[PDB]
Amino acid sequence: AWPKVQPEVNIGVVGHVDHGKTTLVQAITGIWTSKHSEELKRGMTIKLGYAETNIGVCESCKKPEAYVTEPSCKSCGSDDEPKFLRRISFIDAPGHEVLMATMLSGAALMDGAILVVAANEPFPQPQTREHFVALGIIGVKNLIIVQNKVDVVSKEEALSQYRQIKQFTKGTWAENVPIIPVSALHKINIDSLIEGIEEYIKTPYRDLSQKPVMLVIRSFDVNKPGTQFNELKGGVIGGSIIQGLFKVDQEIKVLPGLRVEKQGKVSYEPIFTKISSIRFGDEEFKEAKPGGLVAIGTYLDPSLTKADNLLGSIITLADAEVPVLWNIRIKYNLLERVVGAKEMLKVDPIRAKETLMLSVGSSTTLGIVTSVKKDEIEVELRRPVAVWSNNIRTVISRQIAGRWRMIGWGLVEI
């Protein structure tokens, strides 16, 4: 048998709208990540999607067919059990141009990524460029490029695009990243992709001794109709642990917390609770480490967690000292081009009184620029952000022609 363990790595799936990200995750894991009404009606990803799979290898078989996602080798001609390698998970991002901030929130959780490029569309499309640049900014450098939809183009066309893609990465951080052609729809060459994931997206080193921090991307009420009272539960909070670890029965807090009034002023009150349960996918555990999207059960009123109410928060231990800042100072750099627009315009300098969008961890917040210098801006936010370390990366967006566009990045200085 294979062990039941949490996923140990998060692989982002990014790329232009409809290039096949979600179909690819389904080809690997058997799971369709889209769970929301609007996603199903529109045929698009809106919220971050998630799926897990075990990975193993049939030692008696040849590669790539030796790589499997279930404990059997019958497909490659062996009655032996495959050797378990690890459990992996996917963070499935939206490709739509208006959902770039959601891709950025997911990118904060990624240990590596697959950039999906459709073989039957001109290259490079706007969000092919924009997601690529975002991965570079955030430092997600363990990248595989997947050339999808090869089932609907000729060999010649696929080869032409392949050369295009290699030339695009030439002279960039991604110069040596592999390109793997697949059909996600017809599940062609998925075994080569799993081999690629093992070779190029290794599980990173973790630091389990640092103060535990989880970035929150989901929160829910898990109580369903027709359930007996003794099976009812408190609110659940979902996210990825970026350092340290968490255990059942630990006292924790959610930051910045709840928006309340305190002395005629808006304030955020930290939400204190205790971990009642820990789950990854359909499995319960007593502790949770980095890797995977964990569901942290709490004793909170489910009205507090319902419908992603806490998206963008962080969870720490109750006694941790974490800055929660309404005003932030950013050591910044600007991109030269608005890469995500259909026509790449030049980026204008930041000016005082501009409203900008700041991506910090899993959070997205608007703020007004109160001060500009050569390498520093100060921003007054509409909601405070939890800043759990010094030199946390932020991505900066500006509204241009009715869309939020990534224009720069920086370090939050505390």
Ligand X SMILES: Nc1nc2c(ncn2[C@@H]2O[C@H](COP(=O)(O)OP(=O)(O)NP(=O)(O)O)[C@@H](O)[C@H]2O)c(=O)[nH]1
Residues that bind ligand X (CB under 6 A): 15, 17-23, 44-45, 94-96, 148-149, 151-152, 183-185, 220, 222, 233, 236, 238, 277-279, 282, 295-297
- Annotated binding residue at 361? no
- Annotated binding residue at 106? no
Residue 279 partner contact from Mg ion, ligand X, none using kind-dependent CB cut-offs of 5 to 8 Å = ligand X
Residue 362 partner contact from Mg ion, ligand X, none using kind-dependent CB cut-offs of 5 to 8 Å = none
Q: Which is nearer to ligand X, 177 or 237 (CB)?
A: 237
Number of H helices, E strands in the chain: 6, 23
Closest distance of CB 49 from Mg ion, Å: 6
Q: How far apart are CA 403 and CA 331, in angstroms?
A: 24
Residue 18 partner contact from Mg ion, ligand X, none using kind-dependent CB cut-offs of 5 to 8 Å = ligand X
- Annotated binding residue at 118? no
Report angle CA 325, 329, 330 to the nearest 5 degrees.
Answer: 120
- Annotated binding residue at 63? no
Q: Which is nearer to ligand X, 22 or 316 (CB)?
A: 22
- Annotated binding residue at 21? yes
Backbone angles phi, psi at 272, to 5 degrees: -95, 135
Backbone angles phi, psi at 29, to 5 degrees: -110, -20
Q: How far apart are CA 72 and CA 219, in angstroms?
A: 35
Q: Does 45 sit near Mg ion (CB under 5 A)?
A: yes
- Annotated binding residue at 40? no
| Strand stretches in 250-313, DSSP E | 251-262, 265-274, 277-280, 283-285, 287-288, 294-297
Residue 184 partner contact from Mg ion, ligand X, none using kind-dependent CB cut-offs of 5 to 8 Å = ligand X
Find where tokens 């022609």 sit: 401
Closest distance of CB 45 from Mg ion, Å: 3
- Annotated binding residue at 184? yes
Task: Report how far apart the first and last C-alpha atoms of the chain are (Å, whole number).
Answer: 49
Q: Which is nearer to Mg ion, 22 or 219 (CB)?
A: 22
Site for Mg ion in 15-34 (CB under 5 A): 21-22
Q: How far apart are CA 398 and CA 356, in angstroms?
A: 5
Q: Which is nearer to ligand X, 151 or 413 (CB)?
A: 151
Closest distance of CB 331 from ligand X, Å: 32
Look up residue 346 and give its DSSP letter: B
Q: Which is nearer to Mg ion, 45 or 240 (CB)?
A: 45
- DSSP states of 348-395 as a string? PPP-TT-EEEEEETTEEEEEEEEEE-SSEEEEEEEEEEE--SSSEEEE
Q: Which is nearer to Mg ion, 116 or 350 (CB)?
A: 116
Closest distance of CB 325 from Mg ion, Å: 33
In this chain, which stretch among 44-52, 137-145, 170-178, 383-391 interacts with Mg ion, using CB under 5 A? 44-52
Strand 283-285 relative to strand 277-280, pairing: antiparallel
- Annotated binding residue at 265? no
Q: Which is nearer to ligand X, 23 or 365 (CB)?
A: 23
Residue 278 partner contact from ligand X, Mg ion, none using kind-dependent CB cut-offs of 5 to 8 Å = ligand X
Half-sphere exposure of 341 (CA within 13 A, CB side): 19
- Annotated binding residue at 207? no
Q: How far apart are CA 373 and CA 352, in angstroms?
A: 10
Find where tokens 């921090």 sit: 213
Site for Mg ion in 110-129 (CB under 5 A): none
Q: Give yes or no for a contact between 388 and 314, defined as CB atoms under 8 angstroms apart.
A: yes
- State CA 111 to chain mean position distance: 9
Return the exposure string of 118-129: e unless at least 16 CB atoms fall within 10 Å of the residue's CB, then b.
bbebebbbbbbb
Pick left, alpha or beta for residue 171 (phi over 0 → left; psi -120 to 50 → alpha; otherwise beta).
Answer: left
- Annotated binding residue at 186? no
Report angle CA 53, 56, 59 to the nearest 5 degrees.
Answer: 165
- Annotated binding residue at 273? no
Please identify the residue of the shown chain whose CB is closest to the bound ligand X. Answer: 95
Q: Which is nearer to ligand X, 21 or 398 (CB)?
A: 21
> 3-class DSSP state for residue 4?
coil
Residue 295 partner contact from ligand X, Mg ion, none using kind-dependent CB cut-offs of 5 to 8 Å = ligand X
Annotated binding-site residues read: 18-23, 43, 45, 58, 61, 73, 76, 148-151, 183-185
Annotated binding-site residues for Zn(2+) read: 58, 61, 73, 76
Residues that bind Mg ion (CB under 5 A): 21-22, 45
Annotated binding-site residues for GTP read: 18-23, 148-151, 183-185
Annotated binding-site residues for Mg(2+) read: 18, 22, 43, 45
